[PDB]
Structure formats: structure tokens, C-alpha cells
Amino acid sequence: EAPHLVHVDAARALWPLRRFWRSTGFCPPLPHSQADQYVLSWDQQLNLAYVGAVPHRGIKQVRTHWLLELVTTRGSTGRGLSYNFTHLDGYLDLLRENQLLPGFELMGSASGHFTDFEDKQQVFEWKDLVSSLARRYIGRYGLAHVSKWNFETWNEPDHHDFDNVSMTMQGFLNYYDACSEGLRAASPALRLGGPGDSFHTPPRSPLSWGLLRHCHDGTNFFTGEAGVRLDYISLHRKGARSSISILEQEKVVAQQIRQLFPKFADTPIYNDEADPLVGWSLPQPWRADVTYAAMVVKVIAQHQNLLLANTTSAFPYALLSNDNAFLSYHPHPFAQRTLTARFQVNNTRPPHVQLLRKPVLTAMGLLALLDEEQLWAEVSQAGTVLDSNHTVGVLASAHRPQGPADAWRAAVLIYASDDTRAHPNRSVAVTLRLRGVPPGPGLVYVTRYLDNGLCSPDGEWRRLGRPVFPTAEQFRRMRAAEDPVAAAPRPLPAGGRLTLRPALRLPSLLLVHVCARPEKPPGQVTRLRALPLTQGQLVLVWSDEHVGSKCLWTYEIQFSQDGKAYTPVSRKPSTFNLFVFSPDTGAVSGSYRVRALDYWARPGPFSDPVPYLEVP
Ligand SMILES: *[C@@H]1O[C@H](CO)[C@@H](O[C@@H]2O[C@H](CO)[C@@H](O[C@@H]3O[C@H](CO[C@H]4O[C@H](CO[C@H]5O[C@H](CO)[C@@H](O)[C@H](O)[C@@H]5O[C@H]5O[C@H](CO)[C@@H](O)[C@H](O)[C@@H]5O)[C@@H](O)[C@H](O[C@H]5O[C@H](CO)[C@@H](O)[C@H](O)[C@@H]5O[C@H]5O[C@H](CO)[C@@H](O)[C@H](O)[C@@H]5O)[C@@H]4O)[C@@H](O)[C@H](O[C@H]4O[C@H](CO)[C@@H](O)[C@H](O)[C@@H]4O[C@H]4O[C@H](CO)[C@@H](O)[C@H](O)[C@@H]4O)[C@@H]3O)[C@H](O)[C@H]2NC(C)=O)[C@H](O)[C@H]1NC(C)=O
Ligand SMILES: *[C@@H]1O[C@H](CO)[C@@H](O[C@@H]2O[C@H](CO)[C@@H](O)[C@H](O)[C@H]2NC(C)=O)[C@H](O)[C@H]1NC(C)=O
Ligand SMILES: *[C@@H]1O[C@H](CO)[C@@H](O)[C@H](O)[C@H]1NC(C)=O
Ligand SMILES: O=C(O)[C@@H]1O[C@@H](O)[C@H](O)[C@@H](O)[C@@H]1O
Ligand SMILES: [Cl-]
């Protein structure tokens, strides 16, 4: 085996790097009218804390099915229709509380009322419903916030998942017009896209091709205008276990759109379910560990280096979402396509829920450290240059600084992944040759590493015999494998060159973070919260909105029980904005506070205290 060479020139900022992957999503179970019980459940509350605790807004939106099953109604068409938004307010406040946006799929029946989009009585009632919504949440969150949301059509229209609603090829086009004008009526600044399906070659995917034709050439059901707003085009294409085939399928579709619809040439394209394998609930061991994490990175790596960065076609790809915010079910907590592993610990009084952070979710924290400029990189084996369409690849960024709380930064993220297949008995030798690093005050570097050996709570869980209701002790042990293995800051050598020679496993991830010293220390931690889990445990979550620099070693957390002094909580070094505090003694009632610790051992200010009192 000739080593894998990786060259990275930090002098050459080639073009901007966009964080186009910062999305997740899910679907409530049956019955859809009870979606509010799944969605406002204490489980989902913990789930979205974990989603929003990824550093530096690493996950932004949460695309959510059946949202309009959170709206109830009263009266009727002739009598006087009135909507109840209370459950929808609950879910949207919950996203807001976790600094997350909804991928607002205009999807549902308002608890029965909507039944047929060929009935024009209803097509109008829908327009006004959408307009009511928008106006209500514009008043609630401000137009600036709501204008960020991705409003979307009903999910996968060509899969007939409409429940008991008559949505014909034509009725669907009517429904769209109601949505487009319903939003228009509230504000021309809101954004609407669709259809959210496969766009198979005709006559397959009738409604997906129909809608494009409609918005491109057809008539508005309301105004009677030529063509209709189409802010973005969303497709779903999944890999069937192949990472490159996702990208290959997207080019085929895109090319068809570019030819059949000249006006849409510059229309943004999303793949808002860009998953490795269709069927989120299917047990797959590779979904449980780093094998999935790395394959996710590998996909993003291909999209950046083979599509976005530099291409003849230069298709207008704008978003990628891995649809994996689902809560998992016994008896496969880890093996489903989820960001977190759910444990329904029923044998406590009362019963409670625990979530474990899976590697895929942590890997999104490594992607989050990527900055706004893409750096020239070349991966080669023997003499031959390898693109991202290979088991080992890389993404590297630079940060052009501005303020005195900020400085130059580079992040090199190297993946080793054979998609869904692992290779436990293999070592991949790599030689990172970083060059061109510009001079700066106190240049340090930090490595963060993931593999199944060192960083897999599933592997730990399996080692402990797969307990169905782990003990507190056992949760602490599984959680010890959540964060990557982190080497402490080592000053760079002189001359501006760094050569590391790691033996990466397969699968595995390596982030090399190189940082200049900012003049000033970190900013302050905000929005500290203490959510109870069970007697003797709680979750601490908080925001890094005003923390500033990304050159962070960890968050120091301090706890003062009774009225005694504050004491540091001993824990694994983590940039993750959430921590489960499970003291072996069980003493948790007191006050907590948190602050950032940068690579130069400089603390930011402490957060406001959060008092906690356990009520048995
Ligand atoms: C500690 O306490 C906890 C309680 O707090 C306990 O937690 C419980 O654990 C149980 C298991 O241990 C859980 O049981 C399992 O539930 C799951 C999930 O059920 C929900 O969702 C189902 C799927 O919905 C998807 O699909 C539909 C349509 O296709 C969509 O409409 C949904 O939107 C959703 O779509 C997404 O997902 C699909 C993926 O499939 C994607 O393709 C889509 O694109 C979307 O992304 C849904 O079917 C369920 O609905 C049932 O129940 C409703 C009431 O809840 C009811 O209204 C529905 O009509 C339906 O009822 C019918 O079926 C159920 C059986 O589930 C019957 O009881 C009922 O009488 C009706 O016949 C629900 O909304 C579920 O997937 C599992 O079901 C499979 O496995 C069990 C075996 O245990 C079988 O009984 C089922 O037949 C089923 O089939 C299995 O076997 C098949 C053949 O071998 C195989 O093909 C399948 O792959 C599968 O393996 C379980 O039922 C329980 O959910 C959970 N409770 C809670 C609150 O979380 C915990 O157990 C306890 N711990 C311990 C250790 O004891
Ligand atoms: C990525 O590399 C794979 C090889 O692993 C490519 O698939 C091969 O190349 C062409 C595709 O048109 C065909 O001859 C075969 O399907 C594959 N050949 C072999 C020998 O495996 C794939 O085309 C590459 N994808 C991209 C986007 O470059
Ligand atoms: C909306 O529904 C909820 C739950 O059923 C209820 O508590 C609330 O009072 C309803 N809203 C109004 C305005 O009555
Ligand atoms: O792959 C899957 O399980 C499913 O794919 C799509 O059909 C659904 O819209 C998603 O809810 C889910 O991700
Ligand atoms: Cl998947």
C-alpha cells in the first residue's frame, strides 16, 4: 500500500465554500392527526436540543412532514371556518428555542377539513389558510425570520402519500397556486419550492414534471398570469448504498431541467432527502457508527469538489439534506437512520427517555468548523491523483478574519469511507502536507479523530451486551465515546508548514484545525438551560451565538450545589453545545454556568446562572 498523500495550499483561497448541507428532517408516525403528540413529546424536545446543539449553526433547518396536521378547525365552509394554531405554535416555538428553522412543507388536511383540491371552495380556503399562517408567524417571529424559511409543497406527490385527500394531477397544480398566492398575499418576500420527488424519466413522476411545466408555461389558477413563482426545485435522490450515484442521479435530472425549461436554468436545486439508502427504519449496522458519519462527509465532499466548486455544467445546486432527525424505535436504537439513539428507559418511576449522540451527528460538528473559503487540495496515491470519487478524500477551508475577536483559521477535513461497507482490519496510511500557511500570532493546530474503535457508542453498547434499559453507569460509559479523540493544541513549526502522517482506520474522520490567536478572548455563552431527564440527571444546553471565534477547546461547566462554591465538572473535551450531567452521587440541585475555553487557555465570560431544583 503506497500512502495516501494529501496536499493543501493554505495560500490559495480558490472560491467561497458554502455550507449547503446544514439540514435535517423527519416524518411523524400514524395517526398523522396526532402528530402533535410525537412532535411536542419530551423525546422530540430532547431530539431538537441535540440537533440545535451542533456548534456554529451546523444544522439549520428541520424539514417536517404533516405540519398542517397541527392546525385544528371549527365550524365549516358555510357556517364560518376558524383555525386553531396552538399545536403548530408549540412546534415552531420549539424550533425557535433551539435556533432552528422549519422546512415548512405545506402538508396536511387541517384535521379533516381539506379533502379535495378539485373542489374550488377548498382551494380558496387553503389560500387564506396559508396567508393566515404566514401573517401570524410574521407577527410572531418577524418578517426577517420567516423570509429565511423554505416553504415547500406536499412531500413526494408522485408517491400518493396524501392520506384521505383527493390530489389529482390537476388538483395538485391548483393546490400549488393556493400556496404560492397564499404566501404572496402575506408577503412577496417569502420563498416557495417543490415538488420534492424523484423526477424519474417520463412518464414516471407525472406530478413532478407537470408542476415544472405549470410554473414555466401554464396559468395561475388565481391571477390568470403566465407562469407561477418557483423559487427552488426540490428532488429526492438516494444512493442505494452508493455515495457517487446520488450525485450521478442529480446531474441526470438537472440536465433534463436545463433543457426542457430554459427559464429555470438558474433556479436553485435542492436534494432535501439526499440519503445513502431509502428506508430510514430499516436496521443497518453501518447506520449506527462512524461508517455512516464518514459516508455523509464523503457525499458532501463529492458535491463540493465535483459539482459546486468547478464544473462545465455548473448546475445550480443549493441545498443538501440528510433526512435523519427521526426518533428510533426498540429494538434498533442505533441501527436506524437517525442523528440520535433513543432509549426509552421504562423501568424507572416515572419512566424517562435518554438520547445518545451518534457519530453522524458529531460529524456534522466537524463540517461546522469549515469556513467560507475553499482551499486547493490534492489527494493522490502512488503518482495518481484521486478525486472525491474514491475511498479517501478531503475538504479544506480558510477563514479571512475581520475583528479583534477573530483571526486566520484553516480546517482540513479528511475522510476515509467505502460507503456502507467497513473494513475493521485495515489501516490507511496518510501523509498530510499543509503548506502556504500565512504568518500570524500564536499559530496552533488541533486534531479531532473519529473511528469505530474509539468513538462509537453502539460499539460500546454492544460490548456491554446490548442492555435494553441501560443503568446510569452504563449510559455514562456509552456517552464517553460520543466526542472525537482530541489532541491538545500544539504550536505550528516555523516556516508555515505542517506535515502529519496519521494511520486512519476505515471508516474514519480527521479534522486538522489550524488557528491564529485572536487579540481578545472568547465571547459569552448564552441561553443556558437545564432540562430534567430523571432523578439524578439533567441536560445542559446553551447557545454559542456571541462566543465569536471557532478556535474552541471545550466548554467549561461549573456547578454549585446548595449555596457553596462553584466547582468545575470533570468531563471529556467537547465543542458540542449540550451535555448530559449524570453525577454518580446524584446531586444536581443547585446552580450551573458555562463558558468557552479557546486553544490558548483563555476563558470567555461565564453565562448567567441557571438555577436547578429537583422535585421528586
Ligand atoms: C418502553 O416504552 C415505550 C413506550 O413509551 C415502548 O415504545 C414502543 O416500542 C414498540 C416496539 O418495541 C414500538 O412498536 C413499533 O412501532 C413502530 C412505529 O409505529 C408507528 O409508525 C409506524 C410507521 O409509520 C410510517 O409509515 C406510515 C405509512 O407507511 C406513515 O403514515 C408514517 O408517516 C410513517 O412514515 C415514515 O416512515 C416510513 C417507514 O416505514 C417511511 O417509509 C415513510 O416515508 C415515513 O418516513 C406506523 O405503522 C404505526 O402505526 C400503527 O400504530 C398506530 C397507533 O400507534 C395506528 O394508528 C396505525 O394504524 C398502526 O397500527 C397498526 O399496526 C400496529 C403495529 O405497529 C398495531 O399495533 C395496530 O393494531 C395496527 O394493526 C405507528 O404510527 C412500528 O414500525 C413497529 O411495527 C412493526 O414491528 C412490529 C413488531 O414489534 C409489528 O407489530 C408491526 O407489524 C410492524 O411490522 C414489523 O414486522 C414486519 C414483518 O415482519 C416488517 O415488515 C416491518 O419492518 C416491522 O419490523 C412497532 O409496532 C412502539 O412504536 C413504541 N411506542 C412509542 C410510543 O414509541 C417500548 O417498547 C418499551 N420498551 C420495551 C423494551 O418494552
Ligand atoms: C466514479 O467512479 C466510478 C468507478 O468506481 C465510475 O463508474 C465507472 O465508470 C463508468 C461510468 O459511466 C462505467 O464504465 C462504469 O459504470 C464504472 N466502471 C468501472 C470500471 O467501475 C463513475 O462513473 C464515477 N462517477 C463520477 C461522477 O465520476
Ligand atoms: C386549541 O386546541 C387546544 C388543544 O385542544 C386547546 O387547549 C385550545 O384551547 C384551543 N384553542 C382555542 C382558542 O380554543
Ligand atoms: O427513506 C425514507 O425512509 C423516506 O424517504 C421518503 O420517501 C420520505 O419522504 C421520508 O420521510 C423518509 O426519509
Ligand atoms: Cl440512509
mmCIF file of C-alpha atoms in Angstrom, residues 36-306:
data_model
loop_
_atom_site.group_PDB
_atom_site.id
_atom_site.type_symbol
_atom_site.label_atom_id
_atom_site.label_comp_id
_atom_site.label_asym_id
_atom_site.label_seq_id
_atom_site.Cartn_x
_atom_site.Cartn_y
_atom_site.Cartn_z
ATOM 1 C CA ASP A 36 -48.570 16.920 17.888
ATOM 2 C CA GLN A 37 -48.027 14.139 20.474
ATOM 3 C CA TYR A 38 -44.888 12.917 18.678
ATOM 4 C CA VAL A 39 -43.732 16.422 17.862
ATOM 5 C CA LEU A 40 -44.242 18.131 21.260
ATOM 6 C CA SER A 41 -43.173 14.987 23.146
ATOM 7 C CA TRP A 42 -40.388 15.252 25.678
ATOM 8 C CA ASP A 43 -38.455 12.943 23.307
ATOM 9 C CA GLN A 44 -38.557 15.393 20.399
ATOM 10 C CA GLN A 45 -37.732 18.239 22.773
ATOM 11 C CA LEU A 46 -34.511 16.412 23.631
ATOM 12 C CA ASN A 47 -34.042 15.431 19.995
ATOM 13 C CA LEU A 48 -34.138 19.045 18.771
ATOM 14 C CA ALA A 49 -31.893 20.208 21.594
ATOM 15 C CA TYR A 50 -29.333 17.710 20.231
ATOM 16 C CA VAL A 51 -29.957 18.895 16.655
ATOM 17 C CA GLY A 52 -29.505 22.584 17.629
ATOM 18 C CA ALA A 53 -26.526 21.914 19.901
ATOM 19 C CA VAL A 54 -24.272 21.324 16.901
ATOM 20 C CA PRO A 55 -21.755 24.163 17.059
ATOM 21 C CA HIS A 56 -21.866 27.204 14.778
ATOM 22 C CA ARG A 57 -25.372 26.564 13.450
ATOM 23 C CA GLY A 58 -24.117 23.346 11.828
ATOM 24 C CA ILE A 59 -27.709 22.224 11.457
ATOM 25 C CA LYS A 60 -30.144 24.973 10.463
ATOM 26 C CA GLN A 61 -33.468 23.639 9.265
ATOM 27 C CA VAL A 62 -35.659 20.703 10.115
ATOM 28 C CA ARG A 63 -37.885 19.676 7.208
ATOM 29 C CA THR A 64 -41.067 18.416 8.816
ATOM 30 C CA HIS A 65 -43.934 16.373 7.258
ATOM 31 C CA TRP A 66 -47.635 16.812 8.154
ATOM 32 C CA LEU A 67 -47.115 20.235 9.724
ATOM 33 C CA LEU A 68 -50.702 21.241 8.875
ATOM 34 C CA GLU A 69 -51.994 18.386 10.948
ATOM 35 C CA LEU A 70 -51.078 20.653 13.896
ATOM 36 C CA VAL A 71 -53.809 23.014 12.844
ATOM 37 C CA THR A 72 -57.289 22.094 14.083
ATOM 38 C CA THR A 73 -60.502 23.740 12.848
ATOM 39 C CA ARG A 74 -64.042 24.600 13.921
ATOM 40 C CA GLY A 75 -67.366 25.481 12.218
ATOM 41 C CA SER A 76 -67.401 24.804 8.475
ATOM 42 C CA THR A 77 -67.342 26.268 4.926
ATOM 43 C CA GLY A 78 -70.792 27.911 5.018
ATOM 44 C CA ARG A 79 -71.046 28.262 8.802
ATOM 45 C CA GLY A 80 -67.728 30.093 9.360
ATOM 46 C CA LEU A 81 -64.309 28.428 9.286
ATOM 47 C CA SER A 82 -61.919 29.060 12.208
ATOM 48 C CA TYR A 83 -58.419 27.640 12.745
ATOM 49 C CA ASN A 84 -56.645 26.637 15.946
ATOM 50 C CA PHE A 85 -52.861 27.036 15.639
ATOM 51 C CA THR A 86 -51.907 26.145 19.209
ATOM 52 C CA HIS A 87 -50.084 22.891 18.455
ATOM 53 C CA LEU A 88 -48.303 24.474 15.493
ATOM 54 C CA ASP A 89 -47.166 27.380 17.681
ATOM 55 C CA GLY A 90 -45.785 24.769 20.071
ATOM 56 C CA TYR A 91 -43.595 23.099 17.425
ATOM 57 C CA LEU A 92 -42.458 26.324 15.777
ATOM 58 C CA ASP A 93 -41.541 27.876 19.178
ATOM 59 C CA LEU A 94 -39.602 24.716 19.907
ATOM 60 C CA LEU A 95 -37.568 25.138 16.746
ATOM 61 C CA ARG A 96 -37.090 28.807 17.617
ATOM 62 C CA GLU A 97 -35.986 27.914 21.129
ATOM 63 C CA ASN A 98 -33.274 25.735 19.562
ATOM 64 C CA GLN A 99 -32.269 28.325 16.936
ATOM 65 C CA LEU A 100 -33.696 26.101 14.187
ATOM 66 C CA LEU A 101 -35.920 26.851 11.202
ATOM 67 C CA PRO A 102 -38.779 24.779 9.812
ATOM 68 C CA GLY A 103 -38.552 23.290 6.347
ATOM 69 C CA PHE A 104 -42.202 24.258 6.086
ATOM 70 C CA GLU A 105 -43.836 21.644 3.913
ATOM 71 C CA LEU A 106 -47.377 22.871 3.399
ATOM 72 C CA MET A 107 -48.648 19.405 4.181
ATOM 73 C CA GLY A 108 -51.802 18.155 5.910
ATOM 74 C CA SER A 109 -55.584 18.456 5.968
ATOM 75 C CA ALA A 110 -56.217 20.767 8.952
ATOM 76 C CA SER A 111 -57.535 17.746 10.889
ATOM 77 C CA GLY A 112 -60.012 16.610 8.237
ATOM 78 C CA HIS A 113 -61.341 19.770 6.644
ATOM 79 C CA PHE A 114 -59.333 19.585 3.425
ATOM 80 C CA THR A 115 -60.362 16.594 1.337
ATOM 81 C CA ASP A 116 -60.297 17.548 -2.347
ATOM 82 C CA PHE A 117 -58.174 20.061 -4.286
ATOM 83 C CA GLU A 118 -60.519 19.909 -7.265
ATOM 84 C CA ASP A 119 -63.223 21.466 -5.106
ATOM 85 C CA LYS A 120 -62.699 25.214 -5.607
ATOM 86 C CA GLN A 121 -64.426 26.058 -2.288
ATOM 87 C CA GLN A 122 -61.432 24.392 -0.653
ATOM 88 C CA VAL A 123 -58.725 25.744 -2.981
ATOM 89 C CA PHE A 124 -59.706 29.265 -1.784
ATOM 90 C CA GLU A 125 -59.930 28.238 1.877
ATOM 91 C CA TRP A 126 -56.375 26.929 1.530
ATOM 92 C CA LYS A 127 -55.088 30.178 0.077
ATOM 93 C CA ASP A 128 -56.423 32.061 3.103
ATOM 94 C CA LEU A 129 -55.120 29.409 5.486
ATOM 95 C CA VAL A 130 -51.602 29.768 4.091
ATOM 96 C CA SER A 131 -51.950 33.559 4.226
ATOM 97 C CA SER A 132 -53.217 33.403 7.807
ATOM 98 C CA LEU A 133 -50.267 31.186 8.824
ATOM 99 C CA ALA A 134 -47.661 33.394 7.208
ATOM 100 C CA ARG A 135 -49.076 36.605 8.684
ATOM 101 C CA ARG A 136 -49.368 35.016 12.141
ATOM 102 C CA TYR A 137 -45.730 33.859 12.225
ATOM 103 C CA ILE A 138 -44.510 37.026 10.611
ATOM 104 C CA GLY A 139 -46.102 38.873 13.536
ATOM 105 C CA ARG A 140 -44.701 36.292 15.924
ATOM 106 C CA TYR A 141 -41.103 35.950 14.696
ATOM 107 C CA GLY A 142 -40.649 38.972 12.407
ATOM 108 C CA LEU A 143 -40.612 39.024 8.606
ATOM 109 C CA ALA A 144 -36.817 38.724 8.601
ATOM 110 C CA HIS A 145 -37.027 35.350 10.250
ATOM 111 C CA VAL A 146 -39.923 33.974 8.264
ATOM 112 C CA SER A 147 -38.313 35.046 4.968
ATOM 113 C CA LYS A 148 -35.492 32.600 5.706
ATOM 114 C CA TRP A 149 -37.888 29.594 5.857
ATOM 115 C CA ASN A 150 -38.139 27.139 2.990
ATOM 116 C CA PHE A 151 -41.882 26.782 2.368
ATOM 117 C CA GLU A 152 -42.440 23.597 0.401
ATOM 118 C CA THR A 153 -45.146 21.588 -1.327
ATOM 119 C CA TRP A 154 -46.655 18.332 -0.147
ATOM 120 C CA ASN A 155 -43.984 15.616 0.178
ATOM 121 C CA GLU A 156 -43.316 13.259 -2.712
ATOM 122 C CA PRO A 157 -46.533 13.927 -4.650
ATOM 123 C CA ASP A 158 -45.849 11.007 -7.029
ATOM 124 C CA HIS A 159 -45.828 8.557 -4.074
ATOM 125 C CA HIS A 160 -49.525 9.295 -3.353
ATOM 126 C CA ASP A 161 -48.932 9.914 0.386
ATOM 127 C CA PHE A 162 -51.932 12.206 0.660
ATOM 128 C CA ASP A 163 -53.888 10.192 3.223
ATOM 129 C CA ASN A 164 -57.588 10.816 2.538
ATOM 130 C CA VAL A 165 -57.168 13.870 0.284
ATOM 131 C CA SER A 166 -58.040 13.813 -3.408
ATOM 132 C CA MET A 167 -54.964 15.243 -5.084
ATOM 133 C CA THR A 168 -55.203 14.798 -8.854
ATOM 134 C CA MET A 169 -52.567 15.819 -11.419
ATOM 135 C CA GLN A 170 -54.651 18.988 -11.893
ATOM 136 C CA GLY A 171 -55.818 19.400 -8.281
ATOM 137 C CA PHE A 172 -52.159 19.361 -7.246
ATOM 138 C CA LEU A 173 -51.446 22.284 -9.583
ATOM 139 C CA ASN A 174 -54.379 24.112 -8.030
ATOM 140 C CA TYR A 175 -53.040 23.350 -4.544
ATOM 141 C CA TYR A 176 -49.681 24.845 -5.542
ATOM 142 C CA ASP A 177 -51.296 28.021 -6.812
ATOM 143 C CA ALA A 178 -53.126 28.411 -3.485
ATOM 144 C CA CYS A 179 -49.824 28.031 -1.625
ATOM 145 C CA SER A 180 -47.926 30.418 -3.959
ATOM 146 C CA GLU A 181 -50.616 33.083 -3.784
ATOM 147 C CA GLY A 182 -51.345 32.352 -0.115
ATOM 148 C CA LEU A 183 -47.787 33.319 0.733
ATOM 149 C CA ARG A 184 -47.753 36.130 -1.825
ATOM 150 C CA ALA A 185 -50.770 37.637 -0.003
ATOM 151 C CA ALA A 186 -48.841 37.876 3.268
ATOM 152 C CA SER A 187 -45.558 38.953 1.660
ATOM 153 C CA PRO A 188 -43.769 38.812 -1.712
ATOM 154 C CA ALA A 189 -40.574 38.130 0.238
ATOM 155 C CA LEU A 190 -41.402 34.562 1.301
ATOM 156 C CA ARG A 191 -39.869 31.595 -0.523
ATOM 157 C CA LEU A 192 -41.675 28.586 -2.070
ATOM 158 C CA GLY A 193 -40.337 25.480 -3.852
ATOM 159 C CA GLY A 194 -41.178 21.893 -4.805
ATOM 160 C CA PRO A 195 -42.198 19.266 -5.707
ATOM 161 C CA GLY A 196 -39.968 17.063 -3.575
ATOM 162 C CA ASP A 197 -39.801 13.850 -5.590
ATOM 163 C CA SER A 198 -37.626 11.722 -7.854
ATOM 164 C CA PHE A 199 -38.193 13.257 -11.280
ATOM 165 C CA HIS A 200 -37.897 9.885 -12.970
ATOM 166 C CA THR A 201 -37.739 9.888 -16.780
ATOM 167 C CA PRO A 202 -41.284 10.228 -18.249
ATOM 168 C CA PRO A 203 -43.990 9.148 -17.992
ATOM 169 C CA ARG A 204 -42.743 8.347 -14.468
ATOM 170 C CA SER A 205 -43.076 11.128 -11.875
ATOM 171 C CA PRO A 206 -46.061 12.786 -13.612
ATOM 172 C CA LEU A 207 -46.755 15.496 -10.991
ATOM 173 C CA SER A 208 -43.106 16.463 -10.661
ATOM 174 C CA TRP A 209 -42.688 17.179 -14.377
ATOM 175 C CA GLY A 210 -46.209 18.616 -14.512
ATOM 176 C CA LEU A 211 -45.524 21.249 -11.879
ATOM 177 C CA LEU A 212 -42.382 22.423 -13.670
ATOM 178 C CA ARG A 213 -44.354 22.756 -16.899
ATOM 179 C CA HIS A 214 -47.127 24.578 -14.985
ATOM 180 C CA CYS A 215 -44.882 27.158 -13.274
ATOM 181 C CA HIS A 216 -42.918 27.570 -16.503
ATOM 182 C CA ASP A 217 -45.762 27.948 -19.062
ATOM 183 C CA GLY A 218 -49.188 27.202 -17.518
ATOM 184 C CA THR A 219 -51.762 29.532 -15.999
ATOM 185 C CA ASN A 220 -52.098 30.812 -12.448
ATOM 186 C CA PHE A 221 -55.387 29.484 -11.017
ATOM 187 C CA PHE A 222 -55.939 32.833 -9.278
ATOM 188 C CA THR A 223 -54.447 35.783 -11.160
ATOM 189 C CA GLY A 224 -54.543 34.090 -14.592
ATOM 190 C CA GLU A 225 -50.916 35.078 -15.166
ATOM 191 C CA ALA A 226 -48.392 33.352 -17.452
ATOM 192 C CA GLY A 227 -46.252 31.059 -15.278
ATOM 193 C CA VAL A 228 -46.031 30.824 -11.477
ATOM 194 C CA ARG A 229 -43.391 31.537 -8.820
ATOM 195 C CA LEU A 230 -40.903 28.693 -8.408
ATOM 196 C CA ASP A 231 -38.142 29.829 -6.086
ATOM 197 C CA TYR A 232 -36.495 26.427 -5.940
ATOM 198 C CA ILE A 233 -36.774 22.918 -7.310
ATOM 199 C CA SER A 234 -36.570 20.109 -4.753
ATOM 200 C CA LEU A 235 -35.829 16.485 -5.659
ATOM 201 C CA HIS A 236 -35.210 13.323 -3.631
ATOM 202 C CA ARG A 237 -32.454 11.036 -4.873
ATOM 203 C CA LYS A 238 -30.909 8.389 -2.684
ATOM 204 C CA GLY A 239 -27.773 6.328 -3.169
ATOM 205 C CA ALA A 240 -28.879 2.698 -2.932
ATOM 206 C CA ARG A 241 -25.675 2.368 -0.829
ATOM 207 C CA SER A 242 -23.525 4.230 -3.398
ATOM 208 C CA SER A 243 -22.342 7.711 -2.474
ATOM 209 C CA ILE A 244 -21.419 8.840 -6.021
ATOM 210 C CA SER A 245 -24.701 7.617 -7.548
ATOM 211 C CA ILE A 246 -26.545 10.340 -5.580
ATOM 212 C CA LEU A 247 -24.554 12.956 -7.456
ATOM 213 C CA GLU A 248 -24.832 10.972 -10.710
ATOM 214 C CA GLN A 249 -28.636 10.851 -10.473
ATOM 215 C CA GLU A 250 -28.816 14.602 -9.682
ATOM 216 C CA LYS A 251 -26.818 15.517 -12.826
ATOM 217 C CA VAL A 252 -29.208 13.497 -14.970
ATOM 218 C CA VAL A 253 -32.269 15.262 -13.574
ATOM 219 C CA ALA A 254 -30.612 18.713 -13.597
ATOM 220 C CA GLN A 255 -29.599 18.267 -17.238
ATOM 221 C CA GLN A 256 -33.189 17.462 -18.161
ATOM 222 C CA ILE A 257 -34.448 20.565 -16.278
ATOM 223 C CA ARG A 258 -31.846 22.761 -18.012
ATOM 224 C CA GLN A 259 -33.030 21.576 -21.478
ATOM 225 C CA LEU A 260 -36.796 21.356 -21.067
ATOM 226 C CA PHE A 261 -37.109 24.618 -19.108
ATOM 227 C CA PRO A 262 -34.738 27.372 -20.197
ATOM 228 C CA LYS A 263 -36.210 29.869 -17.686
ATOM 229 C CA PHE A 264 -35.364 27.581 -14.772
ATOM 230 C CA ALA A 265 -31.689 27.433 -15.840
ATOM 231 C CA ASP A 266 -30.691 29.465 -12.753
ATOM 232 C CA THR A 267 -33.425 28.111 -10.449
ATOM 233 C CA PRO A 268 -31.851 26.661 -7.270
ATOM 234 C CA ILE A 269 -31.975 22.871 -6.921
ATOM 235 C CA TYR A 270 -32.267 21.075 -3.597
ATOM 236 C CA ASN A 271 -31.913 17.400 -2.800
ATOM 237 C CA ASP A 272 -33.802 17.588 0.515
ATOM 238 C CA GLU A 273 -33.638 13.843 1.110
ATOM 239 C CA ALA A 274 -30.141 13.043 -0.140
ATOM 240 C CA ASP A 275 -29.808 9.789 1.864
ATOM 241 C CA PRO A 276 -27.431 6.827 1.289
ATOM 242 C CA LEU A 277 -30.297 4.328 1.451
ATOM 243 C CA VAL A 278 -34.073 4.727 1.268
ATOM 244 C CA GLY A 279 -35.990 3.396 4.279
ATOM 245 C CA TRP A 280 -34.990 5.187 7.475
ATOM 246 C CA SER A 281 -36.415 2.485 9.796
ATOM 247 C CA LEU A 282 -34.525 -0.404 8.163
ATOM 248 C CA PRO A 283 -31.912 -1.823 10.542
ATOM 249 C CA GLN A 284 -28.439 -1.333 9.133
ATOM 250 C CA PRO A 285 -25.397 -1.735 11.388
ATOM 251 C CA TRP A 286 -23.434 0.836 9.329
ATOM 252 C CA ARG A 287 -26.047 3.441 10.271
ATOM 253 C CA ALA A 288 -25.033 3.170 13.901
ATOM 254 C CA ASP A 289 -21.367 4.134 13.888
ATOM 255 C CA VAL A 290 -18.772 6.170 12.025
ATOM 256 C CA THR A 291 -19.420 4.270 8.761
ATOM 257 C CA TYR A 292 -22.482 6.497 8.261
ATOM 258 C CA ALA A 293 -20.827 9.649 9.591
ATOM 259 C CA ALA A 294 -17.940 9.354 7.115
ATOM 260 C CA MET A 295 -20.127 8.425 4.190
ATOM 261 C CA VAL A 296 -22.173 11.598 4.894
ATOM 262 C CA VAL A 297 -18.996 13.722 4.778
ATOM 263 C CA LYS A 298 -17.867 11.801 1.667
ATOM 264 C CA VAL A 299 -21.089 12.680 -0.115
ATOM 265 C CA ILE A 300 -20.743 16.354 0.787
ATOM 266 C CA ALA A 301 -17.095 16.236 -0.272
ATOM 267 C CA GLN A 302 -18.120 14.933 -3.721
ATOM 268 C CA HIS A 303 -20.849 17.544 -4.104
ATOM 269 C CA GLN A 304 -18.389 20.342 -3.347
ATOM 270 C CA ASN A 305 -15.363 19.112 -5.348
ATOM 271 C CA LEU A 306 -17.212 17.533 -8.314
#
